[PDB]
């Protein structure tokens, strides 16, 4: 039952076809449900009335079948458009849309043929084994507020580092990975640390 969605479509189509076939055995008010016997045991006048009843019943059944097939075809077309969009954005590229190509951070996708559909294998990145750290929006050094260029200020209790937001890679607070914006009075929650300057030890 892993491929439940495809089996559902197959079962719906088979059930609709079987119902349409079984509707041929209904009388619809006629003396007999088989046309050959009606033509065999009736004169053209009365046989005409019986055949008219059979015709109206079978035509109504066929109209119902075609209407439900059209609705199911619209649903299948919506599904196929979604599948084409997922092929374009998940397989032919890397998607930033959340949950569009799997639960997690999308990395890539692989298509696989199915008897009446497509199976997408979404390879995604899921963070795990998180740890709690102390954190500050900025760092006040020499009366200047330093903000991380692309990371996060974190603290294990005694030292402050810059780490990328989705993986713990602590790094020394430096001018290379931070930028200065004004004094440290305006920002709320700023802490004090020394922003190591690479140039000074070389000089």
């Amino acid at each position: 039952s892993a491929l439940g969605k495809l089996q559902d479509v197959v079962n719906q189509n088979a059930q609709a076809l079987n119902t349409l076939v079984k509707q041929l055995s209904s009388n619809f008010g006629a003396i007999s449900s088989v046309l050959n016997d009606i033509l065999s045991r009736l004169d053209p006048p009365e046989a005409e009335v019986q055949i008219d009843r059979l015709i109206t019943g079978r035509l109504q059944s066929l109209q119902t079948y075609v209407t439900q097939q059209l609705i199911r075809a619209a649903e299948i077309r919506a599904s196929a458009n979604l599948a084409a969009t997922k092929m374009s954005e998940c397989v032919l590229g890397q998607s930033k849309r959340v949950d569009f190509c799997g639960k997690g951070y999308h990395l890539m996708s692989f298509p696989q043929s199915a008897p009446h559909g497509v199976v997408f294998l979404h390879v995604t990145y899921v963070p795990a084994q998180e740890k709690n750290f102390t954190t500050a929006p900025a760092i006040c050094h020499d009366g200047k507020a330093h903000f991380p260029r692309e990371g996060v200020f974190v603290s294990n209790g005694t030292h402050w580092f810059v780490t990328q937001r989705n993986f713990y890679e602590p790094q020394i607070i430096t001018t290379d990975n931070t930028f200065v914006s004004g004094n440290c009075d305006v920002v709320i929650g700023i802490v004090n640390n020394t922003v190591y300057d690479p140039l000074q030890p070389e000089l």
Binding site: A2, L3, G4, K5, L6, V9, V10, N13, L17, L20, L24, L35, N36, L54, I55, R58, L59, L62, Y65, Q69, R72, A73, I76, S79, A80, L82, A83, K86, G102, K103, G104, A114, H116, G117, V118, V119, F120, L121, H122, V123, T124, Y125, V126, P127, A128, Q129, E130, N132, F133, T134, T135, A136, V152, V154, T163, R165, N166, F167, Y168, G189
Partner: protein, 86 residues
């Protein structure tokens, strides 16, 4: 229940994931006997929010998940004239 009268299943205080949906938040599942319960929406996880605390991942997992999408159904043709009249 709000859905109606259920006979043959025993009410239980405990909440589990829905197995057979009766309705109005009540489901039924087989566990020797058939039990009826208000379904469990999920675990209660109160995230340790603080104004100076962050949670940074230290490891990762590469997860590959399957999504099945129908793209076509059987192309069927019903000849109206011979269907109705043979």
């Amino acid at each position: 229940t709000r859905a109606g009268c259920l006979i043959g299943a025993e009410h239980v205080n405990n909440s589990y994931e829905c197995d057979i949906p009766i309705g109005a938040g009540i489901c039924a599942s087989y566990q020797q006997s058939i039990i009826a319960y208000t379904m469990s929406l999920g675990a209660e996880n109160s995230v340790a929010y603080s104004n100076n605390s962050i949670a940074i991942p230290t490891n990762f997992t590469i997860s590959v998940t399957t999504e099945i999408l129908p793209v076509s159904m059987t192309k069927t043709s019903v000849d109206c004239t011979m269907y109705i009249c043979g």
